[PDB]
DNA sequence: GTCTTAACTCGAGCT
DNA sequence: CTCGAGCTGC
DNA sequence: GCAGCTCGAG
DNA sequence: AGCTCGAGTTAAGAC
């Protein structure tokens, strides 16, 4: 019978706030509108003024202030058959806010208490004894008001998209298409944003960053989100935009989704004695990653046999990209056969006798030598098959490299 | 997931002022759905005239140049907006979020239409490139290839005929011109593997994607390692409401197909160099939809 | 037969970014390898010289406001040490099928619109609009400030077909009137080609190259890049110039806005010259919006009447309506 | 609370400011508005250190 | 007829950056290929020369400070070991249409302004402003500190038409009075050319090249860039230069009609007659000489101020700015 | 964690150091200060490799 | 029903 | 002011 | 092996 | 200490 300790409490907790600005001329016409309202009438305004707003989790407004559409709260769907992951795997922690008039927002804060100390969100649609025994309000008003408190969580009564709703077509298997009218996922957005609030500038995460700065090891893990992008959607004013956005800063962080060539470089590789040197951030980072696994034992024969093999594949592919961006002297001569300079057709024999069947395939050995000069020649694993099997990995990778090299122009 | 008989390769397609958001929680290269629908629309206009079938689209990103400015307060970048025209009332315009960037991409079109044999492959390629130029991809203009240098033609290669030696030689020849850019493919296997791996900690799916796509540091120091470039992508649109007849949905731009309110569904994609893939057809993205369940995904099943 | 709640038209005559470079007028005809203009940073020190808000009775307060100057870091683009000619290169495409709506709610409305469009085309072709666009392309109206104070402006338009061959034309912006449109054989040919492209020939590509004589070390005026986010710290750039491929350029839409400056039939026509083809005849620079909706010249009103009520407006209004449809937007 | 009130043409600029030493930010905002020598300047309230507290455009409301 | 909240005037007489180089005064006739002055860095120590708080000023505080000296890095540009002449090259253009507003909210205001401007031009031409500008171009006022302590300063102003040199001019900055404007045939011709250009009678392009004798290995004073490092010099293409605005500010040192008649002499045309170095702004708004008041009265109320004030107003319109509300 | 504590006249030098093998840098800093054998030397902490971790002048605080 | 401006009360610095 | 962590004596 | 004590950063 | 000012906040006319 504790519901009254929430309704008669929260409202009384609310009235006391309505007294800070209340004079003897206002305390009279507000006495029964607040004091007695805590009993039955403060809720009367709600069930009468709940149709003004609408609790939802996916809205249309974020895509334009002028647009008008249909907001939705219901999401029981979850058809994720392979790893797929989105708004359909929350279940709980569904933090939802309202859509409508800016006049009344605390009316929703009263409904927001549907979990503040009990399972009242389940009682907001059932458990009438909670309202008919503790709240002791009539079922003709209380449970009827409970309906208008549930009607706030459903559509106004008509479906509709808009000309700016950002619709699409969509094909089907051998038959005619269907079109979707997607919306904004406020709930998932807020879940992610709370995660980011917690990790980006949390207390424990900040302490872990301090530990990384002081080179001190303790039992905690911290991560960094770079290259976020800020979206100032909803307009300058929080009002006229999603209430959750208004509660938050009003800017939605977007996780980077760029390809590996976003921050391009100014191609300048005409250093000529430095043919295989070619040092850049990706190259040196891959080299440091290899040397960091070179300081491991053979207890991870398999683990270090793939990550390092995949890594050298990445390295040779990055060298291929170097060559490509070049395409578009002795130390560059054999490289002039690997790094075909301009696909030179001018030279008669230097381009059809020194290149026709003359793909200097020693460049692979040049690069293997540069790598052996990069990753230390620690004999700790050379005695056993650890570094010898690493050499075999290198060898077969460079063999596939030369297989791809043979046919530059042949 | 039909096996494509032949593949048409658009050598280079430049785009200016494209759509760089492509998703509520991510920004960057446009969603693959945009390309699948693009190829579908091409089939919709030229496919009927030439009686060809296009279902597979390959993606190679040659150049990506965004329009962003880094603020001095934080390390989070922002986009460069445009100026909207003055409203009719005469008051100042309202600023709205938008994105623009320069994207140079090359597309691979899987030709499943049997009619290809009835027409010259080179002519089909030229005709397709002509329509491709006038079309608008990702929400921005497609700039045709006009410059001081010679133009870049479209090469069509048949993958049904020939010995494995000729097939491999042709595939190698194609990769030679597609090397400057990196391809895009969807990897959901690792995502599910990690989900089961970290299920003990908490049964959170979004958390796993967030944790995987970040610089993870462990206390010891060291930085967590990933096998390749992994990034979130809009895997598809899950059904958010039941289907409604075209009349029920107001302001629908078409009365032929019913409207459905959907949400966003993510995944985990990987950027792999063309040389790693042996068969190009496994790279092509194919859209598959289920009428009963609202799951619509563009992931390429043949890659696995 | 009501209107369609959803109407959209893909824009036509969509240009691309405009790259810039510098060089010598002598080599302009024979050299197209001119190096690009790189953006640079400069500092400026200022004395507040704007209008006053406080009572103008404060002598020493004003002196103190002076002694506290203003500092800001800006971006400027200037030609090389020895360069008197500016080059701008941008392409332009004509898609066609202007009247063809991209999306329409009702089929009947779309058919009715197409019928009205066909009637208009039969009565009179787009030759008027094509000729107006021809003038804009010939002259440097797309250029905003570079044209002012120019000795000789030379525009060269090449129609790029699959191959390099083209019906290359050459004009003079200064000789051609900026505020007046005159007929010429070359202009007519170009207008005809544009009209064909607009009708939906299938492919149209126009490479525009401009050469403007400004002076050695002169300052060009590219399009300032908007941000909308000032920043939480000091030491920033209060002017960012748009640059692509480490070269300055002008936004595609800013060029496409100037190219469609054919609305000369506005009601006032009292001293004002050509105006941008925009709904409600809005103008950003002047800050006023001509053609308010109360009158009948409004685009929405004219189109609704001419479609539903079949009221044929003046030939001028019909041209304006077709121009707006070409520009595209969201209606209903 | 020491607050430095500055005026500039553009929101991004460096100029000296008077030390108000007011109790709260609302006070500094109203003080800057009451004591303004120009129309196009942008009032910018800043603490004793280099951290920017808030700014206000001529035709816009306070923003942080 | 209230004023327009939005008023802007594109600047006229817009110069370019001013590059610098060195050479021998003898070779002055042929000055091309001369190597530019490259900025360099030099360590420099400091000490306590500023004003101490007599309370914070104590015997041992000084011993501490001077025993802990504030090092500093700065940038200076000096001529080569054997070089006595500095060279400055900057172009100048005359656009015209000074009165023509770039943007105006109300059409009536723009028309009224144009009418007043046309009336002024008809009554009297820009010959006065052009003649005053001519003096600044002839003399080295554009140079700020390089002129000080110079043996001989020779300015050469050419005229470029269609890529050819229409007419050249050679003057002497020292002989021409800095604070006094005297009439001369060459100055009059230059003023006529400038007046024609502003009125819109034809394109005007002026290449200004100055040669000043300072001394061997002397230290030039280029324009300092905005801010360890204290002083940062502005270099373009690995060459020192002077800012465009800094030159256009000096070229417009035409305001000598102030209400004080002090010995300061020429003042730059700036609203409210502000001066940074002197730290005082003449023509305060309390008086009627302020630019804003003058324009408001002479446009809206048709009150024609003195001819001098009209010249000042035209100079302000030429300078450009942001007006209204 | 092997940390090399060195003493030198100028920040730029190559002089050998003792291997402390402490857990964290704060420990190495306190140890270096407590074990400084000279007044005008410049403490330089470096890892087992040649990478400079931090340096501290006689009259100045630690820098990274 | 709706959003807007003009209105209210509110708080802090000169003379 | 309070707060870590290497050395030496029991 | 153990722990009181000293020292120096925050 | 009365009064000024502006910030914060209110609610009714008009669409």
Residue numbers in the entry:
A (entry chain A): 3, 12 to 280, 285 to 342, 353 to 434
B (entry chain B): 3 to 222, 239 to 322
C (entry chain H): 25 to 356
D (entry chain J), F (entry chain I): 3 to 66
E (entry chain G): 25 to 251, 260 to 357
Original authors' sentences:
We show that AcrIF9 inhibits the crRNA-guided surveillance complex (Csy) by sterically blocking the hybridization of target DNA to the crRNA guide.
While target dsDNA (i.e., protospacer and PAM) binding is inhibited at sub-stoichiometric concentrations of AcrIF9 to Csy, dsDNA binding is unexpectedly restored at higher stoichiometric ratios of AcrIF9. To discern how interactions between AcrIF9 and Csy trigger binding to non-sequence-specific dsDNA, we next determined the structure of the Csy–AcrIF9 complex bound to dsDNA at a nominal resolution of ~4.2 Å. The reconstruction reveals two stretches of non-contiguous helical density that are not accounted for by Csy or AcrIF9 but are consistent with the size and shape of B-form DNA. The model reveals that both dsDNA segments are interacting with a positive patch on AcrIF9. Notably, the positive patch on AcrIF9 is composed of five conserved residues (K31, R32, K36, K58, and R63). We suggest that Acr-triggered interactions with non-sequence-specific dsDNA could represent an additional layer of immune suppression by sequestering the surveillance system through non-productive associations with dsDNA.
